[PDB]
Amino acid sequence: VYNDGYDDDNYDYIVKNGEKWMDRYEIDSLIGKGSFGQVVKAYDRVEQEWVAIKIIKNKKAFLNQAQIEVRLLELMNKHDTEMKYYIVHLKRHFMFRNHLCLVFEMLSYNLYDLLRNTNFRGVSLNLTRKFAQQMCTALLFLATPELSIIHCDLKPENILLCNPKRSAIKIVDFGSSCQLGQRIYQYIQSRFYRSPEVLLGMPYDLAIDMWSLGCILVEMHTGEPLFSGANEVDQMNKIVEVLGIPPAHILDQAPKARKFFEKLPDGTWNLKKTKDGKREYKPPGTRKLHNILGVETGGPGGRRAGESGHTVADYLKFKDLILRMLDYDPKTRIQPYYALQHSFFK
Ligand SMILES: O=c1c(O)c(-c2ccc(O)c(O)c2)oc2c(O[C@@H]3O[C@H](CO)[C@@H](O)[C@H](O)[C@H]3O)c(O)cc(O)c12
Fold first, then answer.
1. I want to staple 330 with a disulfide (CB 3.0 to 4.6 A). Which of 32, 56, 207, 225 is the partner?
2. Spatial distance between the Cα atoms of 293 and 344, rounded to a whole number of angstroms
3. CB of 260 closer than 8 Å to CB of 245
4. CB-based burial of residue 35 (10 Å sphere; 0-12 exposed, 13-18 middle, 19+ buried)?
């Protein structure tokens, strides 16, 4: 009925465990599914190693976006082995039965699965520091002028562990990514990790990934998302609870500024007033990250009192770096090279 019987009604390849492709790949199991298509675990019989295969939907719009993804991955390969790693390596791409397939190295589970393994108690600040250092190094690689790649969907699920017993991680899935001079989407990033400039409908650059990283790092240590908005208005309001009203010079140039805020006659911006006798959000900037992290009270849940790398000085350094990553202004938000110089690391 669809693609000579190889596709379902949603342009997806019907995965059958054990099938052999091109006398090379033995499909093992379904790993996951997304809007792009599916991801399967497979054994490369020629190279004798496990691989992950992204099976793109047999539909032109998804094929074309994956062709951009392949070009970006290949651009990173011309620099690869010669620059910051911490990025999932594209091993091969090919067409198979009207599906574009992307072969990657097979890694372990993602950082959200790690959080779930701890029952969302969070991981230590020492492990968070290691994750932060590797991700800042990976963002520095993307910031290479010839690359200038914006990932556009950084989240715990898109950061994979190399080995479930080690701290090595890699960024995965550049299916929504773009170069700085080639921006085509505006509804980008997962909502919890969406930058203010994207929420405000402003032009964005590579700084949006650094905003996502700040949200990710706090969640990794606390076990819970920092800004868990159910919609765009709720997301902006949860950001304002912690960070306050964005600067006026930003809101004055934001096309969607009045979707969340109001400009009083004095030129000062305020939040749009909620309705009737409904409970208000915390006043702007009163949900202090200082207390979300438990800087003076033994960390999240008080579980870190006396733990090495969890001194008050350590939490003050971590809080400072996060606030630099959560700068409202994308032109002054901390950049990957200078995040790596932060005293949180050395
Ligand atoms: O080695 C891999 C691996 O172990 C995994 C993987 C592990 C653990 C999971 O719980 C999982 O759902 C996927 O996915 C991979 C991929 O899929 C990504 O998965 C993410 C979830 O983490 C989604 O967010 C992305 O959309 C999706 O592309 C790849 O594109 C490439 C890979 O090399 C792997």
1. 207
2. 15
3. no
4. exposed
Q: What is the Å distance from ligand 1's center to 39 Cα?
A: 7
At 210, give phi and psi (nearest 5°).
-70, -35
| Catalytic residue (one of 153, 209, 314, 327) | 153
Q: Please enumerate in sequence order all residues whose Cβ is within 8 A of that of 346, keeping only pairs 6 or more positions apart, or say none.
A: none
* Distance of alpha carbon 210 from alpha carbon 215, whole angstroms: 9
Q: Which residue intervals of the chain bear CATH 3.30.200.20? A: 3-70+89-105
On whether the CB atoms of residues 167 and 187 are closer than 8 A, the answer is: no
Q: From ligand 1's centre to the CA of 7, what distance in Å?
A: 22
* Ligand 1 atom at minimum distance from 173 CA: 28
Reply yes or no on whether 153 is catalytic.
Answer: yes
What three-state secondary structure class fits 31? strand
Q: Would you say 189 is a known binding-site residue?
A: no
Write down the number of H helices and E strands in the chain: 10, 12
CA separation (Å) from 144 to 89, 105, 150?
17, 23, 11
- Provide the experimental method for this PDB entry: X-ray
Q: Categorise residue 100: left if φ over 0, alpha if ψ from -120 to 50, beta otherwise.
A: beta
Residue (of 258, 322, 52) closest to 170 by Cα position: 52
CA distance between the termini of the chain:
60
What is the rounded distance in angstroms from the CA atom of residue 227 to the CA atom of residue 240?
Answer: 10
The fold for domain 111-340 equals Transferase(Phosphotransferase); domain 1 (1.10.510)
Q: Where in the chain is the domain with CATH 1.10.510.10?
A: 111-340
Neighbouring C-beta atoms of residue 184, cutoff 10 Å: 8
Beginning with the edge strand found earlier in the chain, give each strand of the sheet holding 25-34 in spatial order.
20-21, 25-34, 37-44, 49-56, 99-105, 90-96
Residue 74 and residue 174 in contact, taking contact as beta carbons nearer than 8 Å: no
How many angstroms separate the CA atoms of 263 and 323, rounded? 25
